[model samples]
Target chain A: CPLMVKVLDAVRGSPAINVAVHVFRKAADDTWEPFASGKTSESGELHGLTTEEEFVEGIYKVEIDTKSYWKALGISPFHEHAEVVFTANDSGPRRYTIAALLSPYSYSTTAVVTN
Target chain B: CPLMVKVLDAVRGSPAINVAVHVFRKAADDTWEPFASGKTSESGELHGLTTEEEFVEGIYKVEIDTKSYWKALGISPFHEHAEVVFTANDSGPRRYTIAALLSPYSYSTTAVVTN
Candidate 1:
């Protein structure tokens, strides 16, 4: 199993193309261990953020570098970054996906799981 | 019974001085109606965000104009504005406060209530 990521604009519902995304797994020491990093494609989607650690149960976090994203568009946002923390259960029969909805003024997130 | 707001730097625990803050109350139309707006003082505190309408039980939102604040300091944040939505229960014995702790790269919030 692998973790998939999608970045969308909250208003336009369009893909947040070429945005940098970083993934991390929570460790026992209350620290975030970087797991992977990638950029969204033209469709605003990035696949396989998680590798062989598919079914491990723990906590995970995804950070979107909104500053750089918005900066490329020549604008400044109030938020420095958008981060989503969620619980991951590999033993469960569901596959989970992280959907990050972003706008210059706001953001929302969801950890969608399906059987 | 007025609503109070405190803005703090998440890192140094210092005041977020002179930051613009906006307040809104949720309405029946699924919209937010502006209630009041003010700027944080040198103490990073803004009192009386709610006026005669204090003790109104409803949903409220606070928007921090982080962009403008950070702009004066010369930096780009990942968020355009920081908005927090919370429930207000004036009938309860507890007095509530909205404390927004912010960093250029992250943010956290709390709706503290005391009985």
Candidate 2:
């Protein structure tokens, strides 16, 4: 596995389960092309979004459909979606983990990248 | 007077100084109306983005221009920007502090709401 995500619910102080995740790679024409997508498991993690061979150097975007998550819990959220866009494997093929925290009105994200 | 923000650089483990911030309120027509705007200080904070009286019950969005921050540091980042949007004062008058962490390719945001 080359890319992964971990999501937490700040309001409930628990892992955000079943949150939708979408991955996209920037094309040569500077457009985003869908690469991979999944939903967070019970532990709020989505693993193996892509293999190292498929996850070569490029620009990528990760979209977290948080509005649906909060709405499902009977909460009204603000943003239609949350996203983290970044360059990957620029320095080399590195393992990446994106950690996100969410609330009805707020959210935070960080990344752990290693060789 | 009521809304605030703090930004940090994950790569350097330092305050993300001089990052641009924009505040907007969702109007009754569901359009975003600009309310306030400023830049983070040396401490990576923007205080008094709005007064208590001005921050009534409504949905709000906070946009952070992180790409310019990293580009100025000679790094090519992934996202054009980062944002956190949520409802405010639904329960009554309260204070909000948005804390954000940024890397060239990643960023996270969390909010602290208080009375």
Candidate 3:
């Protein structure tokens, strides 16, 4: 299964291009280790963040550096950054995605793990 | 300011009473150590999750055991549970709140920091 991240600007109703995205995999001792990171493309998408990584049943973290983006748009970001933690259940679908609906003042993130 | 959490059921437009809540503070070693936990009261609120603890500028995690709540209602939660990670900035805000708008299929979480 491929794991990807997509972010959107809720205020402008457009893709959040060039937003910095980071991924971390949780280890057995409860520590989070950075695995991959990249900036979103024109489609507000970053593909194959976990491409070479094995999809195990555990926790993963998706972080978006929102302050950088909001600052470029001349607005003070309400929060410094946005992070989401979700479990990757190996039982279901073969694809996983973390989609973030974001604005300068607030953001909502959700993850999908398919069978 | 004090930090608190409020969780509500979007489907019923009411308090998600008795829902189990967990909190973890990210340590310097990138590990998440459990700091506090409790269940929501009749108002669907948990007070003082970070009470008596020093407020430092760092990351913290709030987890809601939605599976346990949904199981009692005879529905399988789309995700295993809900976890939100946000930074606790020591600068401007004296109070912080994590408010979750949740349903069986989806959830939206928002955090507020106020002076």
Candidate 4:
């Protein structure tokens, strides 16, 4: 459950807007049994951790606060949240580095295994 | 319509998979009016262009051949194509540099406007 995920995104949305944004993530179960929380730094980097949950072989969904990301730029974008679904194989002992590249309009995500 | 896009993805699927991935994008209109075609490099970089179709203000979608990407990985990921939808503002006169970092299990994307 100690798997860490790091995301790199645009802080200002796109070429048109600039704003301070923060994103958080939690399990659909919403239980402290597996805690997930995160925030994007001023430079537009969003990160989260599945604490005490240790990486397991299963799928997880993370949330991105597009609203907050755009608001900091003084703009109202179309969507409020960005969701990424990933399945982890817990059979390895390593750090999981996941990343996302985003503008105000779109984004993509993937996981990196750095044991 | 002569706008170009450069993508950076894992040449292979993920650390868990590796396949020569070929992703091609065409207009929903399916007209030569605007062309988008791309292939992942031997190292995992995907790129395409919106040729002869100057940049206009609207939404665009690019495809990722996950099935093709994974086949080269020797594993069968539970998906086939990965689609990314983005909106472009016709108001800008500049180059857009979008980037994505990928492993086997996940990937991310963003648009970098350089005018």
Estimated TM-score for each candidate: 0.50, 0.67, 0.78, 0.45
Q: Which lDDT tens digits does candidate 1 get at residues A32-73?
A: 788788998999999866664454766666778765777787
Model 1: per-residue lDDT, tens digit, B20-77? 9998888898688898889999999888766644648776768887657767778744
lDDT by residue (B10-111, candidate 3, tens digit) is: 767898889899988888888888988999999999996765367566777788988788787777665556777766766667788888887765677777
Superposed model 2: Cα runs more than 4 Å off? B1-15, B20-63, B70-80, B85-106, B110-115
Better of 1 and 2 by lDDT: 2
Instruction: Give the per-residue Cα lDDT of candidate 4 at B87.
Output: 50
Chain A accuracy of model 1 expressed as TM-score: 0.86
Query: What interface Cα RMSD is found for model 1?
Result: 10.9
What CAPRI class is candidate 1? incorrect
- What does candidate 2's lDDT look like per residue over B1-115, in tens digits? 5899999998888999999999888888878899999999999999978887788877788889998999999997766678777677557447788888887766778767777
Enumerate the chain B TM-scores of all models: 0.87, 0.94, 0.91, 0.58
lDDT, candidate 2, equals: 0.85
**DockQ-best of 1 and 3:** 3
On a 0 to 100 scale, what is the lDDT of residue B18 in model 4? 35
Candidate 3 residue-wise lDDT at B59? 75
Best candidate, DockQ: 3
- Residue A7: error of model 2 in Å? 1.0
lDDT of 3 at B87: 69
- Return the clash pairs for model 2, or none: A107-B109, A108-B109, A109-B108, A109-B109, B1-B48
Which of candidates 1 and 3 is the stronger one according to lDDT?
A: 3
Off by more than 4 A, model 3: A28-30, A51-53, A72-74, A112-115, B50-53, B56-58, B90-93
Q: How much is the lDDT of residue B34 in candidate 1?
A: 91
Q: Assess the local accuracy of residue A33 in candidate 3 as a C-alpha lDDT between 0 and 100.
A: 78
